């Protein structure tokens, strides 16, 4: 049931000082701690993607590189997760992260992913409710080796930031939700990303893709929608982080300027 629905345009913007995360799980208070890790560099070129479905294949798969900074100002129901892997078909393993209103499912199988994958919602007349289907995300999922169900991390103007790293067997996800007063989507200032999950995956990830949710029309089978998101790439960089009295990273310097 793989259908091509999403077209995507891209512009380039400034990261400013976004993308800082807690590099370990150690409480530090009122110190300057210098750490060398995969960080999003300050004032780096970040790609702003606008993905539009109106009611051909123009939604390519992005590289993963050394890790991905992801940001979105959209609501929690439009962008519903991500796809990670190398070939994104049945010959290699892949990682699927899907959020819905109640929980998140993170699941590593041999998915035969569609070229334009999207979670579609549709009303079911026997269940008498709007259900969600992954049959437009993949056509099959076999030899499935990991599953993790937990509370969702796309919940409810609100800027949602994620950092994905794939380091020595573990898929590390860091996240932060920041209420941004109406203005520039990527704001100034600092908001450190707290460690959200470390997943013992142990797969090869070189490419990634964002999952959108599309609604059936009931009035060109799907309702027209738009999703804007920012992608930046992590680099091995040395940062000097300021930990204040309560253990919060309130400041950092990127050591190239």
């Amino acid at each position, epitope marked *: 049931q793989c259908v091509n629905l999403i077209t995507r345009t891209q512009s380039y913007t400034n990261s400013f000082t976004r993308g800082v995360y807690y590099p370990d799980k150690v409480f530090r208070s009122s110190v300057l701690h210098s750490t060398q890790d995969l960080f999003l560099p300050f004032f780096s070129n970040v790609t702003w993607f606008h993905a539009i479905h109106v009611s051909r294949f123009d939604n390519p798969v992005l590289p993963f590189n050394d890790g991905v900074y992801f940001a979105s100002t959209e609501k929690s129901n439009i962008i519903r997760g991500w796809i990670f892997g190398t070939t994104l078909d049945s010959k290699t393993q892949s990682l699927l992260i899907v959020n819905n209103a109640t929980n998140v499912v993170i699941k590593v199988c041999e998915f035969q992913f569609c070229n334009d994958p999207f979670l579609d919602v549709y*009303y079911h007349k*026997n269940n008498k409710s709007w259900m969600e289907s992954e049959f437009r995300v993949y056509s099959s999922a076999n030899n499935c080796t990991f599953e993790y169900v937990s509370q969702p991390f796309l919940m409810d103007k609100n800027l949602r930031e994620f950092v994905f790293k794939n380091i020595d067997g573990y898929f590390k996800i860091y996240s932060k939700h920041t209420p941004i007063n109406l203005g520039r989507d990527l704001p100034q200032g600092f908001s450190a990303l707290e460690p959200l999950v470390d997943l013992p995956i142990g797969i090869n990830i070189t490419r990634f893709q964002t999952l959108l949710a599309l609604h059936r029309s009931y009035l060109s089978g799907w309702t027209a929608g738009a999703a804007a998101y920012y992608v930046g790439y992590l680099q091995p960089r040395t940062f000097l982080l300021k930990y204040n009295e309560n253990g919060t990273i309130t400041d950092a310097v990127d050591c190239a300027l």
Partner: antibody, heavy 128, light 112 residues
Framework: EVQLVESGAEVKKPGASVKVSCKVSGYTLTELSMHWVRQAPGKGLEWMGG????????MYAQKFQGRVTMTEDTSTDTAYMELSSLRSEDTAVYYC?????????????????????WGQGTTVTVSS | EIVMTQSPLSSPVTLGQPASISCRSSQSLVHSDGNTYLSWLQQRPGQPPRLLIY???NRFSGVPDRFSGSGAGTDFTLKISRVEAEDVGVYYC?????????FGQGTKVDIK
């Protein structure tokens, strides 16, 4: 847009089942209320029965209860209709009609009732 | 069971002149959802009926702007602003509120 295609016309001696099919496309069969309407020649077209989006699933006409059964195959997206005990008055053109079960967004949706998209008719004739 | 009455049975209309078809229900078609469900269907000889108008006056997709619906409660009308050579055939009004769904006896519109 929903597109409906039909099965073939048939003739059968009375006392055996009739298999009238309707294949949907564009929308799958679980998003659609499905109805079946009979038209005898020289008479107005009358409703045999169909889906109820609330307070039950399937309703039948009072003059077709005990004969008509309608089955839905989600895998092939086909609405089948069967009726036993054919009579000589049953020589008629059979229409499969359909509608969306709801209308609106997932946040705001309401139940819809009616017969919007009609397929081609299948002529069921009962003779010797 | 809701019985429908059509009026008049056959209406000879010249080309382009407006034609009015009355649909009447012996029971009020107000549904608990708030909407009232009456639809106006057109049938040509050798062709299945197609939905002209759903929900009193809303136009279905692909329907020209010469078909209008009006009325409420128990009194409904279909008004055709221009009659052309493609408008010959039998017109029906149907309800969808109370089961069983019923249909009118049909009105035949011709040219001469």
């Amino acid at each position: 847009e929903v597109q409906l295609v039909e099965s073939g016309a048939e003739v059968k001696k009375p006392g055996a089942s009739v298999k009238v099919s309707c294949k949907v496309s564009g929308y799958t069969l679980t998003e659609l209320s499905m109805h079946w309407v009979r038209q005898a020649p020289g008479k107005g077209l009358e409703w045999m029965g169909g889906f109820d989006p609330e307070d039950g699933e399937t309703m039948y006409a009072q003059k077709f209860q005990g004969r008509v059964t309608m089955t839905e195959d989600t895998s092939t997206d086909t609405a089948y209709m069967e009726l036993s005990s054919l009579r000589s008055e049953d020589t008629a053109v059979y229409y499969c009609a359909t509608s969306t079960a709801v209308a609106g967004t997932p946040d705001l949706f309401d139940y819809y009732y009616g017969m919007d998209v009609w397929g081609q008719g299948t002529t069921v004739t009962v003779s010797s | 069971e809701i019985v429908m009455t059509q009026s008049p049975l056959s209406s000879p209309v010249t080309l382009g002149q407006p034609a009015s078809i009355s649909c009447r229900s012996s029971q009020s078609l107000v549904h608990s959802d708030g909407n009232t469900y009456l639809s106006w269907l057109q049938q040509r000889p050798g062709q299945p009926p197609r939905l002209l108008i759903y929900k009193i006056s809303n136009r279905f997709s692909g329907v020209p702007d010469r078909f209008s619906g009006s009325g409420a409660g128990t009194d409904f009308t279909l008004k055709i602003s221009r009659v052309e050579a493609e408008d010959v055939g039998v017109y029906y009004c149907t309800q969808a509120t109370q089961f069983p769904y019923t249909f009118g006896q049909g009105t035949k519109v011709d040219i001469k």
